[PDB]
Design a protein around this ligand. Structure first.
Ligand SMILES: Nc1nc2c(ncn2[C@@H]2O[C@H](COP(=O)(O)OP(=O)(O)OP(=O)(O)O)[C@@H](O)[C@H]2O)c(=O)[nH]1
Ligand SMILES: [Mg+2]
Lengths: 102, 99, 134, 225, 52, 257
RNA sequence: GCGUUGGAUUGUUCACCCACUAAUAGGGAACGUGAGCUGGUAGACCGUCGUGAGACAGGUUAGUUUUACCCUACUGAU
RNA sequence: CUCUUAAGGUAGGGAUUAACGAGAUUCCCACUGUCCCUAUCUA
């Protein structure tokens, strides 16, 4: 229970830093927030695409209705084959409403 | 608390009663400047304002007194607050004579 | 001060927390608040006075420009049973209120309805602004 | 008003008829009345009277002294163990340091201990949760800066404390950071511009506290050069 | 409601509508204003400040 | 306390080049609020005329008064005329700019001082001192009204090791573009999530969860991390907590207190 | 010697606010363990903890001592 | 060290939300001896 001490000389190991050498090294991580998608973008239906897997049922129904209404402006685009890929498996869905919307 | 309140009442009577040498009229301003040396005037009144410090001492030492566990401790804290007030006022010997 | 004459005694009708009428067209309808000038100091007793007594008051009903604003003025009617030192007991239909500055000078310029004899004798500008005494 | 009007009035009319005689007689009776106030004025007023009279005596003694008087090493070695200035300080009981605190509606659990004296917690303190904290170091009894004096230079400075290395009472108290008398602390000294041989700036030094800051809000200390 | 002027008139319109009036015919302006001020904060009345 | 040659010695040393580089990097780092230092305890943060000598209050004014002429003297005598006219014009201007008879205004009701109290602010400072993170809840109707800048200044000066983020709440009451505008305006300084509090229909829950577990990953040594909720009354602190837990944990009411 | 107020405020008051006033001075006889009258265990809920029974860093709510006719003192009466 | 976070508000109509209760609480009208400030009467 001393106020000053040494480990030992410890032959073989790196020597040491003496007693008072200041260590000016650090690391600074940067925080990352979500975007939250509060501002309308042209790529907005690509985000509603995945709501066809939503655990809720009215969500899926209203999403299918939105995609129904947005057909003529997207019929020739990079979104239609993923739309059908992600919506075809709703044939085995639990709801007459969603099957009818499809 | 009473000792603090007395000092700040006194100092407030000085600060509010005395005029603001700026903010009055240019004629009176220049007259009182050539009479009393505006710089000295403002400096003295600023000294009194900054001394009105006493509030800090009173608040700090009261908040310390909340944890007093003995008559001797509480007495010494009281004495300390009043002594620091006295030091502040002792450093106000010349401005009050001027004022 | 402001009044002309002595502190004379007529019975008390108007304690603190009493809404009384204003009938002049300065804008107010009502007068409430705390204070009575020349009131004593006794434990548990209410400040209540008349004798053309000056009191602090606010407009409970009236124009917003003078609502929210404390003001002095003078009792002119009481509706309690007062005694004249010349004979009979007097009393009015109602209480009445009305407005002034600390010197006794009125914000309004004319009074409706009767005003008390002793109130007018004590306050000159009330007697000038009143067309009807008693 | 308007100027020194009473000075003008004294020049024009003049002070009274019975002014100089009365002033002379007041100055004469003052000798009697001084002693009268001494044998009277019971209490604080007599105490203050005696204080004033003693100070006045000393002033006149010094004045007369000044009147009547106005009527081997070299320069560089003039002005000149490793023991600290305070070994063997008063010992503090654990009872006098820790206050008991009781918890519950029916207060029956105590298990909590409030440190009564001034403390140094650190820079990133961040209190523990209440169900998990046992040691309580209240915010008012938490010091960041001390009043450190260099014995040389006759100078003091309000320096920020960096650490507590040795409180002589029960080195638990060092880890708690209790600033009792005789406690040894690391303080920053960058304001003084000290530099070692090599050009490395010194920014930390040992100091020993000289006061009992539980009685005074001040933490006064002496540098160990 | 509709088409008011004069918030003093607004209150009396709303009181005559809600049947919120005193013994007589004086519409209770005080309680109606209290309810309006509760609605304003609680979000029954939509309102918002614009930023720069 | 025994003698030792290890007292009286320099205990903490640093070279000038390392010192200056360390100053520069941290001046870069700690101006950015999205950045955060990891340890913060092993690091040195501590490394980051007068006329009375001439005139003695007594030669200026008094019976002694060794002061006959000024030093506040303009030459070219017309110059002080140019000054006096300018000063009179400025004076008359201030008069009409800032532009009594024996009536007063009624007392302020004692209910308007309810947020202000020793009892409440003791709880505030207790919560902060116990917290590792401080969320500042704002109403999207009036965030700058509901901001409380003095607490942020206190947290800057006193406690830089705390994190101090913003949460816009009641975003369901205003349009989406107002919320986006405010979030853009405030993300410049502080992260500033948007939120809507409800046990059933919520918004921002997962984002806030992600941010809190980020701070947890940073404070890996503390064994737990405390998050205080600061703000005006009736902003939704209790409702945000009830939203995170997804049941009624804290009492809630539309009345403030 | 004689007086030293009326009120607002329980998201609380070891206090402050505005008025009236001649003034709105401080204290004791209880609080140097514990003593008029009035606000501030058993049931139940939320929170923290606990494997649990339960406990508490908490918080909210409801919730039965009942003299004098005895001696003395005091007040009046034979 | 890296990047995904699908407790994503489906929409900017997303929360303006019964009746009942010797349940806990605040305010208003009316009303009064609760109060100023006590007085009187009956068994
Ligand atoms: N529309 C909407 N209302 C909210 C939201 N959050 C809270 N509220 C409402 O705001 C009312 C008062 O806010 P509180 O939840 O009490 O927030 P608080 O005042 O910080 O809570 P306390 O700490 O208990 O005082 C609640 O009764 C809620 O009904 C929100 O996100 N959207
Ligand atoms: Mg609230």
């Amino acid at each position: 229970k001393q106020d000053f001490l040494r480990k030992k000389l410890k032959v073989g190991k790196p020597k040491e830093k003496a007693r008072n050498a200041t260590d000016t090294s650090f690391v600074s991580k940067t925080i990352s927030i979500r975007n939250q998608h509060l501002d309308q973008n042209p790529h907005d239906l690509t985000k509603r695409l995945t709501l066809l897997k939503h655990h809720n049922i009215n969500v899926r129904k209203e999403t299918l209705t939105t995609f129904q209404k947005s057909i003529p402006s997207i019929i020739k685009s990079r979104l239609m084959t993923p739309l059908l890929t992600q919506s075809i498996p709703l044939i085995c869905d639990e709801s007459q409403q969603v099957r009818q919307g499809l | 608390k009473y000792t603090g309140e007395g000092f700040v009442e006194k100092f407030e009577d000085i600060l509010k009663g005395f005029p603001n040498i700026n903010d009055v009229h240019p004629f009176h301003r220049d007259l009182m400047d050539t009479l009393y040396e505006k710089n000295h005037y403002k400096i003295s009144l600023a000294a009194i304002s900054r001394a009105k410090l006493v509030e800090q001492v009173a608040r700090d030492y009261v908040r310390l007194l909340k944890f007093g566990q003995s008559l001797f401790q509480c007495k010494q804290l009281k004495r300390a607050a009043l002594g620091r007030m006295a030091t502040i006022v002792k450093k106000l010997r010349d401005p009050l004579a001027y004022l | 001060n402001g009044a002309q004459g002595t502190k004379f005694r007529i019975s008390l009708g108007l304690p603190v927390g009493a809404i009384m009428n204003c009938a002049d067209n300065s804008g107010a309808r009502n007068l409430y608040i705390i204070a009575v000038k020349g009131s004593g100091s006794r434990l548990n007793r209410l400040p209540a006075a008349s004798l053309g007594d000056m009191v602090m008051a606010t407009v409970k009903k009236g124009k917003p420009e003078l609502r929210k604003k404390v003001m002095p003025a003078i009792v002119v009617r009481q509706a309690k049973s007062w005694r004249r030192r010349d004979g009979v007991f007097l009393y009015f239909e109602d209480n009445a209120g009305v407005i002034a500055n600390p010197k006794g000078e009125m914000k309004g310029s004319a009074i409706t309805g009767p005003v008390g004899k002793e109130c007018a004798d004590l306050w000159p500008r009330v007697a000038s602004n009143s067309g009807v005494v008693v | 008003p308007q100027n020194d009007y009473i000075e003008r009035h004294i020049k024009q009319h003049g002070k009274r008829l019975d002014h100089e005689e009365r002033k002379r007689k007041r100055e004469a009776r003052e000798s009697h009345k001084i002693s009268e106030r001494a044998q009277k004025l019971t209490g604080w007023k007599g105490k203050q009277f005696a204080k004033k009279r003693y100070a006045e005596k000393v002033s006149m003694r010094k004045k007369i002294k000044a009147h009547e008087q106005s009527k081997a090493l070299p320069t560089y070695l003039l002005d000149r163990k490793f023991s600290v200035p305070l070994p063997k300080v008063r010992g503090i009981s654990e009872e006098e340091m820790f206050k008991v605190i009781k918890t519950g509606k029916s207060r029956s659990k105590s298990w909590k201990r409030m440190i009564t004296k001034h403390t140094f917690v650190g820079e990133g303190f961040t209190r523990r949760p209440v169900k998990m904290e046992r040691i309580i170091r209240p915010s008012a009894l938490r010091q960041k800066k001390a009043n450190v004096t260099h014995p040389e230079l006759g100078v003091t400075v309000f320096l920020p404390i960096l650490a507590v290395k040795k409180n002589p009472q029960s080195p638990m108290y060092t880890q708690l950071g209790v600033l009792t008398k005789g406690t040894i602390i690391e303080v920053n000294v960058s304001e003084l511009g000290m530099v070692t041989a090599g050009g490395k700036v010194v920014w930390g030094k040992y100091a020993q506290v000289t006061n009992e800051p539980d009685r005074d809000g001040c933490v006064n200390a002496v540098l160990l050069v | 409601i509709s088409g008011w002027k004069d918030a003093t008139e607004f209150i009396e319109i709303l009181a005559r509508k809600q049947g919120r009036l005193l013994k007589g015919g004086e519409p209770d302006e005080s309680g109606v204003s209290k309810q309006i001020l509760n609605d304003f904060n609680r979000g029954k009345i939509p309102w918002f400040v614009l930023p720069p | 306390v025994q003698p030792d040659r290890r007292w009286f010695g320099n205990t903490r040393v640093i070279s000038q080049d390392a010192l200056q580089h360390f100053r520069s990097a941290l001046g870069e780092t700690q101006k950015d609020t999205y950045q955060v230092l990891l340890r913060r305890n092993k690091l040195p943060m501590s490394l980051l005329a007068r006329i009375l000598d001439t005139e003695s209050y007594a030669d200026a004014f008094g019976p002694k008064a060794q002061r006959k002429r000024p030093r506040l003297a303009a030459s070219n005598l017309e110059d002080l005329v140019k000054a006096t006219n300018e000063d009179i014009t400025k004076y008359e201007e201030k008069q009409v700019l800032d532009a009594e008879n024996g009536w007063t205004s009624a007392a302020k009701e004692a209910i308007f001082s309810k947020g202000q109290s020793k009892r409440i602010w003791n709880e505030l400072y207790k919560v902060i001192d116990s917290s590792d993170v401080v969320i500042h809840v704002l109403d999207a109707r009036d965030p700058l009204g509901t901001r409380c800048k003095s607490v942020e200044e206190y947290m800057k000066k006193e406690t830089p090791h705390k994190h101090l983020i913003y949460v816009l709440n009641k975003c369901d009451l205003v349009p989406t573009w107002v919320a986006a505008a405010w979030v853009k305006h405030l993300s410049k300084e502080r992260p500033t999530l948007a939120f809507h509090a409800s046990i059933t229909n919520s918004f921002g829950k997962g984002s806030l969860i992600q941010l809190l577990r980020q701070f947890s990953q940073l404070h890996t040594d503390r064994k737990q991390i405390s998050v205080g909720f600061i703000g005006y009354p009736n902003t939704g602190k209790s409702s945000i907590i009830n939203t995170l837990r997804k049941k009624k944990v804290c009492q809630v009411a539309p009345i403030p207190g």
